[PDB]
Design a binder for this molecule. Structure first.
Ligand SMILES: [Cl-]
Ligand SMILES: [Cl-]
Ligand SMILES: [Cl-]
Ligand SMILES: [Cl-]
Ligand SMILES: [Cl-]
Ligand SMILES: [Cl-]
Ligand SMILES: [Cl-]
Ligand SMILES: [Cl-]
Ligand SMILES: [Cl-]
Ligand SMILES: [Cl-]
Ligand SMILES: [Cl-]
Ligand SMILES: [Cl-]
Ligand SMILES: [Cl-]
Ligand SMILES: [Cl-]
Ligand SMILES: [Cl-]
Ligand SMILES: [Cl-]
Ligand SMILES: [Cl-]
Ligand SMILES: [Cl-]
Ligand SMILES: [Cl-]
Ligand SMILES: [Cl-]
Ligand SMILES: [Cl-]
Ligand SMILES: [Cl-]
Ligand SMILES: [Cl-]
Ligand SMILES: [Cl-]
Ligand SMILES: [Cl-]
Ligand SMILES: [Cl-]
Ligand SMILES: [Cl-]
Ligand SMILES: [Cl-]
Ligand SMILES: [Cl-]
Ligand SMILES: [Cl-]
Ligand SMILES: [Cl-]
Ligand SMILES: [Cl-]
Ligand SMILES: [Cl-]
Ligand SMILES: [Cl-]
Ligand SMILES: [Cl-]
Ligand SMILES: [Cl-]
Ligand SMILES: [Cl-]
Ligand SMILES: [Cl-]
Ligand SMILES: [Cl-]
Ligand SMILES: [Cl-]
Ligand SMILES: [Cl-]
Ligand SMILES: [Cl-]
Ligand SMILES: [Cl-]
Ligand SMILES: [Cl-]
Ligand SMILES: [Cl-]
Ligand SMILES: [Cl-]
Ligand SMILES: [Cl-]
Ligand SMILES: [Cl-]
Ligand SMILES: [Cl-]
Ligand SMILES: [Cl-]
Ligand SMILES: [Cl-]
Ligand SMILES: [Cl-]
Ligand SMILES: [Cl-]
Ligand SMILES: [Cl-]
Ligand SMILES: [Cl-]
Ligand SMILES: [Cl-]
Ligand SMILES: [Cl-]
Ligand SMILES: [Cl-]
Ligand SMILES: [Cl-]
Ligand SMILES: [Cl-]
Ligand SMILES: [Cl-]
Ligand SMILES: [Cl-]
Ligand SMILES: [Cl-]
Ligand SMILES: [Cl-]
Ligand SMILES: [Cl-]
Ligand SMILES: [Cl-]
Ligand SMILES: [Cl-]
Ligand SMILES: [Cl-]
Ligand SMILES: [Cl-]
Ligand SMILES: [Cl-]
Ligand SMILES: [Cl-]
Ligand SMILES: [Cl-]
Ligand SMILES: [Cl-]
Ligand SMILES: [Cl-]
Lengths: 329, 329, 329, 329, 329, 329
């Protein structure tokens, strides 16, 4: 009923060789912790307790002990959590917290393609606009074209969402022809149809990698970790009004490939944004947009002194253009 | 740049008497931890480090030691975190996690009334529909009617959001007369104007307490902790389509006072929902709606076997009516 | 519109090493033909043409040439067709004919667990009685207990059909408790509940291997290749009446473990039964039951001279008992 | 013991004139192949080897050589197989495959009337519901009324099954009066008694030709080759549930003469259905129903996107009515 | 439209105990009158009528009756007006007149820190030179450094004006670094930066108390009540020219701590200056400067016989130096 | 030393006829009060006490008693205070308060022409810009042209300030020729030279009456009592910045005769502005500008919702133009 508390049972096992390959096929997902770190230990134990009847294994691989198995799997960063799913290895880069870890694993454990089989689900599909989506129409799950699409979906999981229908009426409402795949940029209503259908998996992966930096995109707690970053609380009328300005500049520079704004909602990342306030010396809980140096953590911020008089989209665009050309960094 | 890690400095001080009343006026907020609890200790230390230059004090009051001060402040639950703000005491009931705690404190530290002074902010105000809102039009901050509204806002902080304008043109767009206050239920576009303006604070608090259980409301990580609960992932086309059905039943029973649905998005509470799956023995990460016994944690769930054929709003309403009348518990 | 004819295009590729592991993950199924055999060549080419847009690869591995890859995969019988599905190897033992091969591959390519999500599907499930079935009730696809059941299903695919539901109402109609699995013998209405739920995969595989020889079972064109064999044309009133007698002896000796009758419908295997007529020197297109020596192909047949006076179930049972004890072989 | 393989002996003789009429009375059945066709050659040779001690002759008539004999017998389609039985000529239109050919010939070689002489056989007769049946009660084989019935049976062989009894007690259980004939439509329990008994052969043939297109009928591998076609796997709980819906619409429109649904089980025709998937661009291995143009191979399919929510019989009937009236083609 | 006249309604309530603490939090400001005084009664009633919809309470505490509450609040001078604001008590020492009282209360009721958020407001800030100002640059209202500054502002309210910005561009124009505070003496353009930023509240209060007696300062009707006093009508060319001489002597003795001139404009205090003319026996409505004994009200005045030949700044400075050394008193 | 309190002595005498004309020449000024009015009584008594050794008489003329003398002097409004100065009668229309009354009388009692005899006084003259000024250059006080100027000055006293010099060097710095008079509009640096010097008194009075409504003018407590009114606190950075915008619109429409803005500083009129807030239902203590109906007290106000983004002078001018043309009233 209330919140779970860790019961003391140690479920995070230590995985050796020979013991290795048995547990990879016992589970859907293998969670590997590569080696004062009682905080990460206890978060991992609580996630393992809460998910104990899911098809997820929790193991730890010591840097000095199972260096054999760590070399066998390619574990560079010590203190990092790696997820194995079949033949694939996923390094978790999100916040090492129980909520974020649970959400990440439950995203990874499901099939990479979500099937839409109802016309009433298409309206809901079209209104979900916060992430990159791909959707295709195939004859069935057995099709070689579905298989190529599913294999591409596995390559981007869980960061990019793939969808498919096998129904003519659903596909008609999505304006999809047979074996065609539409690509949806975030916060844009009109999809891009991938050229020269039907597609191999290499054709799908290459298209998605070209279009992986859209004009505006929303940070997620899973996928994270020169750089234009905008801060807007969607739950606040100020931040929401600013978000609508950012959406307007996104639809004006779909032609511009050198424009990629990362929108961070502070309500989605309250600890991270508060920590960044100490580094950037600015109030990031009111509307801001800046460019950050990846190395030196230097920053320059657009002047938004008055949240009752936010910049228009043209004023944002002019500041953006001065930054790419060279205003300051 | 990356995520904050706790540096070892102990900022959570132990607060005695005589030392007490000085620190209540040094800070905007006083965070009091009432007494194997290294998990809550380390979360509290990391929040204290991240917020160290905010006007927030972090203290701990031992149950056996400062039982004098604990009796002076009324600390019942040991292991609970209490927030002092001026004359007010707030027990934190959310998840004891760094993200949720930071967001709660930054919500509490700000002024309880958000001032809207721009017509472009009204459109954004009207689109924010996920929580109960109140908005009033007053002559200025000095008005006795604003003061009554601000004092009512302080009484419900941070669970219910209060807004005010001092501008005639903003108020005209909100259809607010002078000293009038509109009450917005979640997921309903049309506000309720509080009768017999101008209002005392007791008149505002009494109105809000009558209307505190609306037909549909969304759980928040701050405010939480017989009971109809619906589970819907808004980020998923299935969960979004179900959410739209729940919104439709909400607008059909605004007359019915015995109808209060609590919508929980599992993406907002991934640890809690996964833990509840073990208690309710049902997949709560796909659309579900049930009634839960507060004491015994018994539950009965509507049959939604096929997410490609969700119930219509009429079928939901009939199941709801059978539950209130007596179908099972 | 009419029947497909082979167009001349050679799609059955020759698979070498290094080229090997790429195509195993390009396809759902890999069809490997291990080396005057123009008949098997042309059947394989026509199946490859008809299924060319399914996720199925057709290759050939020469016994002398890719003896490296043939040793790598364990190909004993030359002239045999092996199906690779993930980590699994399936030797096709059925009739080398286009109909039987297509049906086998389309059975293998689908998910080994068929999900039942509708109460109207349970009635149809219960009426399907010609093969061994297993059905379980699990919380979701993510459950470790579903995963054990799915892994057991993969081990017996496509010879034994596995089913699952995630719905309480469906499970109630099947009389299934949570994580319980029911085992259905052919031509018996009442399932056997597998003891000591929840089950590991080794517990499921061991139960199924004990119960793999039921009292009566129907030969299939996929699964085939001391032995009591009964011949009955279900489409003929004579053969149907005899089939009903065989079903009656099956329900009388559920206790007897040394009783396993193989029913062959000649309309399902017209070429094979006609060929066996030349070996057994008896008309197998009218009701017959016999015991066949596996080595010497000797046989002894029950006297059924008059199909207007078929044996009763007691007369069949007495003949069966004389055969196990020792009447003749 | 295993499957037959063709031994090399050439039994398919070439038939000239003068040599012709001798072999027509040597055999029960004469199999005539009218002229890169090594596939049909080798299938015919294997059937001839397997059936070599049956009263069946296998000959080939070249289009250019014995054009005399081909004109004498009326051989239009080259590459077609014609069966001679007494005075009758049967063109085989099924799949040119060894299983289908063996089953066809063994159906044709037997007497066209199956005699039922046991009351226990009547129960089995009544449960066999998948094809059109006729059954009559006569005094004996010598009766002129049996002879008319037998001659009608020969005219429809092997596509329509004829049955007779000479026993009063059997006939009483079938509710047959002396010289009366009952006509059974597929999937309907209640027969139609042919009016104005006793019957001449022309009276029987004319009745059967009027009732040759029933409301629902199952395709057979023998008899095959505007058109409503339904696809349902009886071995699958989904396909079985759909089949039961099709049976329900059949019993609701026994009055409607313009309603004739052809049910194809894909497990009976796996190669043909897979080939049709490429022509109709739809998954025919899950429940579907469509109308197909005989000329252009155009098709329009009922929307069945969700096999957990199949159409009811009323929804099927409404779609059927829209198709006959004119929805699309 | 015209001037307000008192309507007769008695709003100045008498405040008892238990009734006390409720009204302190009902209002922003509590106006307490501590006990032939119909003049002060009627002024207080007119102010209470004019401000009746402001968050200001008007009460009276009788010296003999609520001597309990008067001892509880520390009311020494009878006939005095005390203002309560939160935890603070302010004795009004100005002229007991409706204009002065209204202006005082409206100064006290507002937030002690005025926020500057526009670059165009900085020019206006810099030109306002008649009073002591403090201005700081902080990250936000939530900052512990803003809180210390706000708490210091509350301690000096309304006599010393505090300002803050949260904007980098505004702060750059003010030459303010982060958490730095500048102190502006009256009639001097260049601020003093308070040393060793960031500041606690005790550090700010101690700095302001050292610098509370600047070289020249202008009397206000709020703040008033050995002593060098200068009289100059700024609205008169004579008085304005003299004021410019006084400003010039102020910039020449910023080093001299024993020099504090109080400038009184008679147009700001016409009743008080006219009354002082009877005590000092000199025309104070033309330029004068004198030193007044605080006890005995003795005075000695600089000889300014000819307002067409005012003293230069050097002549003023020499007279000032003779007075501090000892010329007369 | 402190503030004067009324001592009880009754100096406000009642003036009869025959007693009348003696006291008009005993005093410089005669203060006549024309008849529950204990407030005006006590203010008048305190002013009379404070000014008792000035050449000012304080009398009262009852409406019913000395109606003879009231008709002789032309006293319309009862409850009004009339000032006699020689042959002139001045009705006091200001706030009936001791400060305002003292300042008014001390303004009236002095000579209407202020003589400037020093070059250092000219700089101070030129910087005094808040009121209409006239300045002339004459040979001496004996000149007929000075006498005409002095007589015109007496006609406008004390509302319009007149100045004169008799010095060539002072006049050269003012750019004044002999007997020339310059007219200074408020807040404009450049004077208007009155045409066709030398002037009669009727020529001066007629010029001043044409130019008595300048583009911007500041309300005074003396002179007060369709109408554009602007509210700006000069002591506040917001109000000061707005005042500078109003000055800028004043210099852009010196051509426009139908533009006369009345600037009211609320710090100069705190009681009156607070009272007007109740009539105009707007916060007049922050920057506002409106047009007020003289009769109905209706008002329409420019939208200034955001004091961090005040209107520019062009936006003010456009709103002004819409008001004169007809936007609303
Ligand atoms: Cl895995
Ligand atoms: Cl956590
Ligand atoms: Cl899905
Ligand atoms: Cl689906
Ligand atoms: Cl599919
Ligand atoms: Cl499909
Ligand atoms: Cl692929
Ligand atoms: Cl995905
Ligand atoms: Cl298409
Ligand atoms: Cl960027
Ligand atoms: Cl970019
Ligand atoms: Cl902040
Ligand atoms: Cl704002
Ligand atoms: Cl506090
Ligand atoms: Cl945490
Ligand atoms: Cl605000
Ligand atoms: Cl605001
Ligand atoms: Cl305000
Ligand atoms: Cl306001
Ligand atoms: Cl209040
Ligand atoms: Cl709030
Ligand atoms: Cl109103
Ligand atoms: Cl509820
Ligand atoms: Cl409820
Ligand atoms: Cl689940
Ligand atoms: Cl779905
Ligand atoms: Cl594979
Ligand atoms: Cl074949
Ligand atoms: Cl399934
Ligand atoms: Cl399903
Ligand atoms: Cl599931
Ligand atoms: Cl589920
Ligand atoms: Cl497993
Ligand atoms: Cl299976
Ligand atoms: Cl259960
Ligand atoms: Cl056996
Ligand atoms: Cl056996
Ligand atoms: Cl028989
Ligand atoms: Cl023949
Ligand atoms: Cl074949
Ligand atoms: Cl027979
Ligand atoms: Cl018979
Ligand atoms: Cl007979
Ligand atoms: Cl007979
Ligand atoms: Cl006949
Ligand atoms: Cl027949
Ligand atoms: Cl009869
Ligand atoms: Cl048809
Ligand atoms: Cl039809
Ligand atoms: Cl398919
Ligand atoms: Cl207060
Ligand atoms: Cl007053
Ligand atoms: Cl402010
Ligand atoms: Cl501000
Ligand atoms: Cl702030
Ligand atoms: Cl800020
Ligand atoms: Cl502080
Ligand atoms: Cl202040
Ligand atoms: Cl700085
Ligand atoms: Cl002094
Ligand atoms: Cl001094
Ligand atoms: Cl006079
Ligand atoms: Cl007064
Ligand atoms: Cl003068
Ligand atoms: Cl002079
Ligand atoms: Cl003179
Ligand atoms: Cl002169
Ligand atoms: Cl004159
Ligand atoms: Cl004057
Ligand atoms: Cl001149
Ligand atoms: Cl005007
Ligand atoms: Cl005007
Ligand atoms: Cl106000
Ligand atoms: Cl401002």
């Amino acid at each position: 009923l209330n919140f779970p508390t860790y019961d003391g049972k140690d479920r995070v096992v230590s995985l050796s060789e020979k013991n290795f390959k048995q547990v990879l096929k016992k589970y859907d997902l293998l969670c590997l912790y590569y080696h004062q770190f009682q905080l990460k230990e206890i978060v991992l134990e609580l996630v393992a307790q809460v998910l104990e009847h899911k098809a997820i294994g929790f193991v730890m691989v010591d840097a000095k002990k199972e260096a054999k198995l760590a070399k066998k799997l390619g574990f560079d960063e010590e203190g990092s959590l790696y997820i194995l799913k079949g033949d694939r290895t996923i390094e978790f880069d999100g916040e090492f917290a129980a909520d974020v870890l649970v959400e990440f694993l439950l995203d990874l454990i499901e099939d990479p393609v979500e099937i839409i089989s109802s016309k009433l689900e298409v309206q809901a599909f079209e209104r979900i606009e916060d992430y990159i989506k791909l959707i295709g129409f195939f004859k069935s799950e057995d099709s070689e074209y579905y298989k190529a699409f599913e294999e591409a979906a596995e390559h981007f999981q869980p960061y990019i969402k793939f969808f498919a229908t096998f129904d003519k009426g659903v596909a008609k409402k999505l304006s999809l022809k047979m074996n065609e795949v539409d690509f949806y940029e975030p916060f844009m209503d009109e999809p891009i149809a991938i050229p020269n259908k039907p597609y191999t998996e290499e054709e799908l992966v290459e298209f998605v990698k070209e279009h992986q930096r859209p004009t505006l995109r929303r940070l997620r707690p899973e996928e994270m970790f020169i750089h234009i970053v905008a801060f807007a609380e969607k739950s606040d009328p100020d931040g929401y009004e600013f978000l609508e300005i950012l959406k307007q500049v996104a639809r004006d520079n779909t032609d511009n490939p050198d424009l990629s704004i990362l929108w961070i909602d502070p309500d989605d990342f309250p600890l991270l944004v508060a920590y960044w306030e100490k580094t950037f010396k600015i109030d990031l809980f009111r509307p801001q947009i800046g460019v950050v140096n990846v190395t030196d953590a230097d920053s320059v911020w657009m002047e938004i002194p008055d949240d009752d008089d936010l910049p228009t989209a043209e004023e944002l665009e002019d500041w953006i253009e001065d930054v790419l050309s060279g205003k300051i960094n």
